[PDB]
Design an enzyme around this catalytic site. Structure first.
Site, short mmCIF file in Angstrom:
data_model
loop_
_atom_site.label_atom_id
_atom_site.label_comp_id
_atom_site.label_asym_id
_atom_site.label_seq_id
_atom_site.Cartn_x
_atom_site.Cartn_y
_atom_site.Cartn_z
N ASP A 94 -6.99 -3.30 7.46
CA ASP A 94 -8.04 -2.43 7.95
C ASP A 94 -9.02 -2.07 6.82
OD1 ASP A 94 -6.29 -0.78 6.54
OD2 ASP A 94 -6.63 0.93 7.86
N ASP A 111 -9.55 0.72 5.00
CA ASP A 111 -9.02 1.32 3.78
C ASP A 111 -8.16 0.34 3.01
OD1 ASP A 111 -9.97 4.24 3.99
OD2 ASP A 111 -9.09 3.86 5.97
N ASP A 137 -3.22 -3.41 3.62
CA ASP A 137 -3.38 -3.40 5.06
C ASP A 137 -4.60 -4.22 5.47
OD1 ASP A 137 -1.21 -1.66 5.05
OD2 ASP A 137 -2.47 0.13 5.12
N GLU A 143 0.79 -1.22 0.00
CA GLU A 143 0.00 0.00 0.00
C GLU A 143 0.83 1.28 0.00
OE1 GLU A 143 -3.43 -0.29 2.52
OE2 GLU A 143 -3.59 1.87 2.78
#
Length: 740
Positions: free
Chosen positions: A438, A440, A436, A362
């Site tokens: 999470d 986003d 990631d 990312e």
DNA sequence: TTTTTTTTTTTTTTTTTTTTTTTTTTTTTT
DNA sequence: AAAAAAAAAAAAAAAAAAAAAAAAAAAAAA
């Protein structure tokens, strides 16, 4: 006192011993007695355990140790004769009511409690006793089936070697020797054995204190890692791989492998009360070190077997190579030559595609964290820059961003323009979307999936696209450690810690409930509580929670006016008594002349606002009330006045299941410490290697397209320009989640 | 064989840019 | 008239550069 506990066990025998309909309770009692005998034998006092199955539906276990309750309650009779110091003492317990160099216990199961299984299937007992004989080296076990006249003698001094021989007796072992050891280091006694065969099937059996582990565990991971490391080192040293022109990996040595692993931890920790997966952190290191030393020593000692094992591994590797698609070598970025690739790319050394990987991460911090921990030979990293263009919404000519151009150049499909697109020139046959853990990260994963599905459709079809699953949380309790992916797994782990090493007693003098039964009760309670929280808008939480403990109200009760009045009056009185706020509960009954049903109503006045909650005919058979009634039937009488719970050292009297669960959770979260990773830049490179870069401990997912039309419709709705179908889809999924 | 300008530390002072997501308007282009 | 494309409001993910201030080694101009 004692009679209270015996009656408590007799009320709910399925809670304590297990499901008696399938005969599992009788087998559980027999294995409990055999386990007690084996525990006596492990202290170096007993050497023979003669288990006799009688014709009167009774079994006796002989012991030869030093010698001188759930089993007493369910058993209608007990013959305990202790032969100690040249004396014979006989004591008879009848439903836990006594009438007055080991023992023979000839327990009589009560026919009332058990149903549909009277006689004992001696094959199951023979299998379990043979397994225990293998695990307990130098411990004779004598099966004596008197009803059929059969007999057996399970006695193997080798132990795990005997287990491997028994497993391989029907199959064709490939070499005669059997690797083995029983080294103990810092109390973690480890026993391993190995023998390959020509079946090309993997069967590794794991045990922990004579308890099988179906789902593997830390010992299994350590065993696999040590085996792969040692065999790869032996292949690299001797140079057989170069002659074969193929690199052996995992699931080739493991192919056609028979092995048994047994561990004995003083304080083992399992993922659940079923004990189907060991999660003890310390067990992996000892197994890994002992395997790394002794398997290499065995390979040095037995070059005849090493050649045959290497030959089988090379044959498997050649088969895997032949299965692959045709391809060609590709230039890779290097110190001398760059080949016109991006600066951010950290390319690998293996020029051959299908032996290389690309990790799409990312950002630059995650890029550095992944670059520090990886394998330079195979794995390459291409860090992106945050969120990328939505190619569904964007025009074709809007794809002039540095983020997408970098992705196009590294894969070298030449997909830009829809004229030079050619997936045959793909530089990496494994494209891994390691975003990631999470929210986003999930969004960026969706955007990358849109790019790969829309602009490079054949790359997704051929199965080159993969998804990594890095963990979001790390949880630690002193020595123990675990990695957790999602909040649902966090909740499951919290429940598992809460039920770890804790006992619930219905009465002050009563035994602990079974771990499996307690887990089932807690799972039912959590499901009902989640349903009640979903129902919080329709009805108050207090009324729904109180409906669990009240008697059930069937449709026949509705016709009788007086019964409904008594039920609703009792409900409202209990709500008023247990009220810790300003709410004022009042009852009313509405009479339907059409159906002749006297439905109840529970008026509430909370925060000065009066409201009515009629429990109509729909609610009585609305589905949720069935779940509430079932949990109520389970939880009517699991807590007497003197109920209490324990967690080893500490004790707590209780009066409700809520209090016990809250105390268990609060003691669970005492030493706990959660580290949430806000992306891969917060993980150490070693943690990244352990979790989601090492092929041994990797967990990936192949992106596949079941239906092209449905996939296209979903992509257009979720990612298109029009907002109304997206809003409708999100609202429909919210309503679906809210409903059952 | 000799000037001159360029890289590297590690504390300081300063700024800069790219996407997602939804309404609503304003261009501009047919 | 008609469609398509760009911008901006507010919370999210990502990142990029320019100089002082000493020593001390390259690597070209002279």
């Amino acid at each position: 006192k004692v009679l209270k506990g015996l009656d408590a066990v007799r009320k709910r025998p399925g809670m304590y011993i297990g499901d008696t309909d399938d005969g599992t309770g009788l087998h559980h009692m027999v294995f409990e007695v055999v386990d007690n005998a084996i525990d006596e034998a492990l202290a170096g006092h007993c050497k023979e355990i003669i288990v006799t199955i009688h014709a009167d539906n009774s079994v006796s276990v002989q012991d030869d140790g030093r010698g001188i309750s759930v089993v007493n309650a369910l058993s209608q009779k007990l013959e305990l004769v202790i032969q100690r110091e040249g004396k014979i003492h006989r004591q008879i317990y009848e439903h836990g009511v006594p009438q007055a160099t080991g023992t023979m216990v000839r327990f009589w199961p009560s026919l009332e409690t058990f149903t549909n299984v009277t006689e004992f299937e001696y094959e199951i007992l023979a299998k379990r006793l043979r397994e225990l004989s293998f695990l307990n080296s130098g411990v004779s076990i004598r099966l004596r089936d008197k009803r059929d006249g059969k007999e057996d003698h399970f006695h193997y001094e080798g132990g795990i070697k005997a287990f491997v021989e028994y497993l391989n007796k029907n199959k064709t072992p490939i070499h005669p020797n059997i690797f083995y050891f029983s080294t103990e280091k810092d109390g973690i006694g480890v026993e391993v054995a190995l023998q390959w065969n020509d079946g090309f099937q993997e069967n590794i059996y794991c045990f922990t204190n004579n308890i099988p582990q179906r789902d593997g565990g830390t010992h299994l991971a350590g065993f696999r890692a040590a085996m792969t490391r040692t065999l790869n080192a032996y292949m690299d040293k001797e140079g057989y791989s170069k002659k074969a022109k193929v690199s052996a990996t995992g699931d080739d040595a493991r192919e056609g492998l028979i092995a048994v692993v047994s561990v004995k931890v003083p304080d083992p920790k399992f993922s659940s009360q079923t004990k189907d997966k060991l999660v003890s952190s310390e067990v992996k290191s000892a197994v890994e070190q002992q395997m790394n030393e002794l398997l290499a020593e065995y390979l040095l000692e037995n070059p005849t077997d090493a050649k045959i094992v290497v030959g089988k591994i090379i044959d498997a590797a050649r088969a895997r190579e032949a299965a692959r698609r045709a391809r060609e070598m590709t230039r890779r970025k290097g110190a001398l030559d760059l080949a016109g690739l991006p600066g951010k790319l950290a390319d690998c050394q293996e020029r051959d595609p299908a032996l290389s990987e690309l990790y799409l991460v990312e950002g630059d911090s995650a890029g550095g964290s992944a670059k520090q921990g990886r394998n330079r030979k195979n794995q390459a990293i291409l860090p992106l820059k945050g969120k990328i263009l939505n190619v569904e919404k964007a025009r074709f000519d809007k794809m002039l961003s540095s983020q997408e151009v970098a992705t196009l150049i590294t894969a070298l499909g030449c997909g830009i323009g829809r004229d030079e697109y050619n997936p045959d020139k793909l530089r990496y046959h494994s494209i891994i979307i390691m975003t990631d853990a999470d929210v986003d990260g999930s969004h960026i994963r969706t955007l990358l999936l849109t790019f790969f599905y829309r602009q490079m459709p054949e790359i997704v079809e051929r199965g080159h696209v993969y998804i990594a699953q890095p963990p979001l949380y790390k949880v630690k309790k002193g020595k123990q450690e675990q990695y957790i992916k999602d909040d649902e797994a966090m909740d499951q782990y919290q429940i598992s810690i809460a039920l770890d090493g804790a006992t619930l007693h219905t009465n002050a003098s009563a035994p602990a409930l079974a771990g499996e039964a307690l887990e089932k009760l807690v799972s039912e309670y959590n499901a009902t509580q989640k349903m009640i929280n979903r129902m919080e808008r329709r009805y108050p939480k207090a009324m729904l929670k109180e409906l669990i403990y009240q008697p059930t109200l069937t449709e026949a009760d509705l016709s009788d006016e007086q019964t409904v009045t008594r039920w609703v009056n009792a409900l409202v009185s209990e709500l008023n008594d247990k009220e810790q706020h300003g709410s004022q509960w009042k009852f009313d009954v509405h009479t339907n002349a059409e159906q002749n049903l006297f439905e109840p109503i529970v008026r509430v006045r909370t925060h000065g606002v009066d409201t009515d909650y009629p429990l109509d005919h729909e609610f009585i058979t609305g589905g949720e009330y069935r779940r509430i009634c079932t949990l109520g039937e389970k939880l009517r009488g699991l807590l007497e006045e003197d109920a209490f719970i324990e967690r080893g050292e500490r004790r707590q009297p209780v009066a409700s299941f809520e209090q016990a669960l809250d105390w268990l959770v609060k003691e669970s979260r005492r030493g706990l410490s959660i580290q949430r990773y806000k992306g891969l830049g917060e993980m150490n490179p070693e943690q990244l290697w352990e979790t989601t870069m090492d092929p041994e401990s990797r967990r990936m997912l192949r992106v596949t397209v079941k239906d092209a039309i449905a996939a296209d419709q979903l992509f257009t709705t979720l990612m298109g320009d029009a907002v109304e179908p997206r809003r409708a889809f999100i609202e429909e999924n919210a309503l679906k989640a809210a409903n059952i």
